[PDB]
Amino acid sequence: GAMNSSNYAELFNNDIKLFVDDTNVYRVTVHKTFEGNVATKAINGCIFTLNPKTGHLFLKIIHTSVWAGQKRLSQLAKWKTAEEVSALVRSLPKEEQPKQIIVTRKAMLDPLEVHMLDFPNIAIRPTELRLPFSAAMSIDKLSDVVMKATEPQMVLFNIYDDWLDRISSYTAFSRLTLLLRALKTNEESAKMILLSDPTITIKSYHLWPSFTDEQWITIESQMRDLILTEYGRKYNV
Amino acid sequence: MNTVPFTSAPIEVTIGIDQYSFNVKENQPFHGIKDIPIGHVHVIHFQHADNSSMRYGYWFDCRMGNFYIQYDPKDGLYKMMEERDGAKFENIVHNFKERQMMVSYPKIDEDDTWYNLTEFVQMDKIRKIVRKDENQFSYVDSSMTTVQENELSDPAHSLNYTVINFKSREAIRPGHEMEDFLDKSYYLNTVMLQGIFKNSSNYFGELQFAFLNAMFFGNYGSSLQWHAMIELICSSATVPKHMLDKLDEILYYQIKTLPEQYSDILLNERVWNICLYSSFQKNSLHNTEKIMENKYPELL
Numbered sequence: 023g024a025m026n027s028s029n030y031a032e033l034f035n036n037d038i039k040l041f042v043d044d045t046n047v048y049r050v051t052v053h054k055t056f057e058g059n060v061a062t063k064a065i066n067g068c069i070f071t072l073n074p075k076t077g078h079l080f081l082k083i084i085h086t087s088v089w090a091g092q093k094r095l096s097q098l099a100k101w102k103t104a105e106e107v108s109a110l111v112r113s114l115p116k117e118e119q120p121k122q123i124i125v126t127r128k129a130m131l132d133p134l135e136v137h138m139l140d141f142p143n144i145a146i147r148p149t150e151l152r153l154p155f156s157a158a159m160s161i162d163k164l165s166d167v168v169m170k171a172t173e174p175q176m177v178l179f180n181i182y183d184d185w186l187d188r189i190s191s192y193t194a195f196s197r198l199t200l201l202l203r204a205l206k207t208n209e210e211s212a213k214m215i216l217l218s219d220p221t222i223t224i225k226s227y228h229l230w231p232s233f234t235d236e237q238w239i240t241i242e243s244q245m246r247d248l249i250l251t252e253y254g255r256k257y258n259v
Numbered sequence: 260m261n262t263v264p265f266t267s268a269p270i271e272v273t274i275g276i277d278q279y280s281f282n283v284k285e286n287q288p289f290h291g292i293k294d295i296p297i298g299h300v301h302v303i304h305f306q307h308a309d310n311s312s313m314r315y316g317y318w319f320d321c322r323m324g325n326f327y328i329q330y331d332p333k334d335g336l337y338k339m340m341e342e343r344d345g346a347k348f349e350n351i352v353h354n355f356k357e358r359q360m361m362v363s364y365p366k367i368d369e370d371d372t373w374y375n376l377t378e379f380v381q382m383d384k385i386r387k388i389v390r391k392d393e394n395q396f397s398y399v400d401s402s403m404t405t406v407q408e409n410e411l412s413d414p415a416h417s418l419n420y421t422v423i424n425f426k427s428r429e430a431i432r433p434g435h436e437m438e439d440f441l442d443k444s445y446y447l448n449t450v451m452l453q454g455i456f457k458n459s460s461n462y463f464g465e466l467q468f469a470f471l472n473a474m475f476f477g478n479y480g481s482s483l484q485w486h487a488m489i490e491l492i493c494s495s496a497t498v499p500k501h502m503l504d505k506l507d508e509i510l511y512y513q514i515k516t517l518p519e520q521y522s523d524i525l526l527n528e529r530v531w532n533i534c535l536y537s538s539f540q541k542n543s544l545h546n547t548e549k550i551m552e553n554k555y556p557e558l559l
């Protein structure tokens with residue numbers, strides 16, 4: 023069934039599982055037309071498919087060409103997501119295929135269930151967690167590969183960089199969700215926290231800066247302060 | 260016209276015959292039902308006065324055999340039986356029809372209700388849903404489960420309705436996942452009508468039999484099946500025009516006959532609101548929509 027705060031250690035057990043977030047699949051800009059009507063222009067999007075235990079991110083880039091001449095794009099986007107996740111599972115060796123797929127939005131349940139009928143033993147589940155995966159496009163290296171794409175593409179990342187050398191996947195996921203929540207809440211301030219100090223850089227093969235263990239404590243504190251600050255600004259607290 | 264005689268009526272019981280019902284008192288001089296219209300299937304049904312548990316009954320056609328009811332005191336119910344030989348049967352019954360102790364099937368001459376509820380129902384198809392080959396009549400009761408219910412427990416005592424499951428590989432062609440899930444036409448027209456039922460008459464017969472078993476026995480799996488068969492048509496964008504017009508007639512007479520006071524248990528609010536106001540056929544069921552809005556506006 024649904025996944026929440028009671029069975030949260032389940033995310034980091036040895037049953038292979040994937041989160042699927044479809045927020046950034048269908049993306050548009052809205053603008054006025056010469057005649058004073060409104061029109062959308064689609065931009066490249068992506069499917070965010072993550073193994074929370076290993077950090078492996080299967081970023082499927084959704085090129086605007088997949089929408090050409092199609093109708094009801096918000097509905098189509100869920101089915102396109104399900105199609106692509108299904109294709110990813112089928113492309114993986116049996117012993118790498120997930121036992122569970124957790125969708126961040128309940129509207130993905132029927133599309134993914136229907137595309138996965140051939141896999142009756144893979145559980146398709148929602149979650150009560152509010153996960154900030156929509157902010158993945160605030161990670162500069164992910165946003166860059168999506169916007170530069172001229173055709174459908176799948177790119178593989180480890181969203182935890184090398185953190186699992188030093189911390190558990192429970193702590194790695196916690197750090198990731200705090201970073202993404204801060205980027206979602208105040209992107210400019212979050213990136214300023216992350217990049218202000220030039221003596222700390224992002225390795226060519228990484229997404230985040232090379233903070234020491236004590237520096238990660240500092241950054242994490244500054245992220246929590248940002249989130250609390252914005253909460254106070256929002257509700258006048 | 261034909262007759263279903265009773266050996267006796269030893270326990271007080273509410274007897275149904277098609278859409279009619281009457282009460283018989285414990286050991287009252289009741290010798291059966293006479294003037295049963297030839298040409299239709301029928302159902303004789305029972306609900307004991309001292310134990311409303313197990314509604315049960317028998318689907319029969321008087322053209323297929325000579326049928327009587329005797330109470331079996333060991334199994335505690337009224338059983339249908341068949342007298343193979345006509346002369347013996349004709350001799351026992353005429354006696355009772357001369358002594359006037361039979362309820363007459365009360366068919367009003369204007370009234371087409373039973374024909375309208377059973378237009379497509381045939382005994383031969385009933386005997387395939389209800390499997391008990393050594394009898395020409397078919398026993399059904401309140402608690403009998405369907406094959407689909409069993410998959411989700413005795414298979415001999417089950418209702419073998421055609422399984423309908425919108426999230427099944429039978430319903431969804433590989434490569435057509437969104438198409439087939441949002442538009443059930445493939446599943447209706449190729450799998451069900453061309454593949455399993457062969458024609459719409461057989462599909463409508465099963466739909467009608469499911470409704471009647473839900474209404475007369477309170478059989479839950481039968482109600483599920485009735486709604487599934489409605490939702491399959493309404494959820495299809497491509498349905499022959501004659502099928503939609505006949506469905507409207509079938510449903511109108513079903514809603515017309517449903518007891519007002521059983522509407523909370525016999526009608527699924529979700530399915531009916533979907534079918535009438537959201538589905539592809541939301542504007543194709545004018546007579547049914549009109550009776551539903553005027554008789555059960557609460558459900559909508």
Ligand SMILES: O=C(O)c1ccc(C(F)F)cc1
Nearest residue numbers: 264265266327328342348351
């Ligand atoms: O065996 C028969 O043919 C038979 C026996 C008893 C009755 C009773 F119902 F009237 C009717 C028919």
